[PDB]
């Protein structure tokens, strides 16, 4: 019928994709952490900070096949596209039967007294069977478990102060009914079954939140283009828009800017330290003016 | 202002930004987080229109 109708919407599409990452050519020391001479006892796990590097995770697949590689807050295959603010590697060796406890929300001897993950956990749990390196016919000192604790552990709370069990109803120093050596050692032989053989575990905790980041995946930078509708990725922050010179006076501390409705409207370029405004690409509704198809097929 | 402000809410999702959900997760998980955002944003539009 004759009239004006609203049909679909129009959008200006981007013409190119611009990705900007900092001047970092240093590789992350994942091989030093995974290819350890020795792994820390689970009761006293070794936390290694990873910073100022490219988190190229292909080296992890080069290191070993894996028993378990389960990511909770991220995809295991998109880790090289992401950029992380703070990455920590918790390295320890545990009994295979306890591997299922290295997960958010779990309980058991390890989740309760040696190493606990928070419920709000973003990261990856990586494990492999290390029997050929850690088991010995005479036993070893790699396995230590804090069987008894006055209270359960909080996530990432390390406590290596050992005294004596308070299992009984009387204070004592080693009395067998009421007191046991606070930290137990266990000996393992290469002939033990799959559930008793040692496994090497590395937990990668990723604070994948907010503006700062020291470690970005292996992306290749491109040139900047201003005053055009483009796709972009700034240190993991992605979107579509027009990048223009900004007149906002950001403090050296401030890195991103936001509007009154908490949307991103400015970024700092990781190499130039230029502040760029983000303008959305033009969009709007499309209306069609029709004389009516019983008169003419011309439309505006 | 309220309708726009609602876009920053998570509605139980891991993140309020849709591009970050797609950037971080594989489709099977992204669909769950996205459905949470769709439910919240659609409910916000119906409230606005009513």
């Amino acid at each position: 019928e004759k009239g004006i109708y609203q049909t679909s919407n129009f959008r200006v599409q981007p013409t190119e994709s611009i990705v900007r990452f900092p001047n970092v050519t240093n590789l992350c020391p994942f091989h030093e952490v995974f290819n350890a001479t020795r792994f820390a006892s689970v009761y006293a796990w070794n936390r290694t900070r990873i910073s100022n590097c490219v988190a190229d995770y292909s080296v992890l697949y080069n290191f070993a096949p894996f028993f378990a590689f389960k990511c909770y807050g991220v995809s295991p295959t998109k880790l090289n596209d992401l950029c992380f603010t703070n990455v920590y590697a918790d390295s320890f060796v545990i009994k295979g039967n306890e591997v299922s406890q290295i997960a958010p929300g779990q309980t058991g001897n390890i989740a309760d007294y040696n190493y606990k993950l928070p419920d709000d956990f973003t990261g990856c749990v990586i494990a492999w069977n290390s029997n050929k390196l850690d088991s010995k016919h005479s036993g070893n000192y790699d396995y230590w478990y804090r069987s008894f604790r006055k209270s359960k552990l909080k996530p990432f709370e390390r406590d290596i102060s050992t005294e004596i069990y308070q299992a009984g109803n009387k204070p004592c120093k080693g009395k067998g009914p009421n007191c046991y050596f606070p930290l137990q050692s266990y000996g393992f032989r290469p002939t033990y079954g799959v559930g008793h053989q040692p496994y090497r575990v590395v937990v990668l905790s990723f604070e994948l939140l907010h503006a700062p980041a020291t470690v970005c995946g292996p992306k290749k930078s491109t040139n900047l283009v201003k005053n055009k509708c483009v796709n972009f990725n700034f240190n993991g922050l992605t979107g579509t828009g027009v990048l223009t010179k900004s007149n906002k006076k950001f403090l050296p501390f401030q890195q991103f800017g936001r509007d009154i409705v908490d949307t991103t409207d400015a970024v700092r370029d990781p190499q130039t330290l230029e502040i760029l405004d983000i303008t959305p690409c033009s969009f709007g509704g499309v209306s069609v003016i029709t004389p009516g198809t019983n008169t003419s097929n011309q439309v505006a | 202002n309220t309708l726009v402000k609602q876009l920053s809410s998570k509605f139980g999702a891991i993140s309020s930004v849709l591009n970050d959900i797609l950037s971080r997760l594989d489709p099977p998980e992204a669909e769950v987080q996205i459905d949470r955002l769709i439910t919240g944003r659609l409910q916000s539009l119906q409230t606005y229109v009513t």
């Binding site: 949307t263 959305p280 509704g285 | 202002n1």
Partner: peptide
């Protein structure tokens, strides 16, 4: 003598109460 040809009172009424708005332009027009 004034643009818009409004009366003095209409001009006052128009001045007391307060076309692309960048704010809120997230699909809402």
């Amino acid at each position: 003598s004034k643009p818009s040809k409004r009366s003095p009172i209409e001009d006052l009424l128009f001045n007391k109460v307060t076309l692309i708005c960048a704010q809120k332009f997230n699909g809402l027009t």
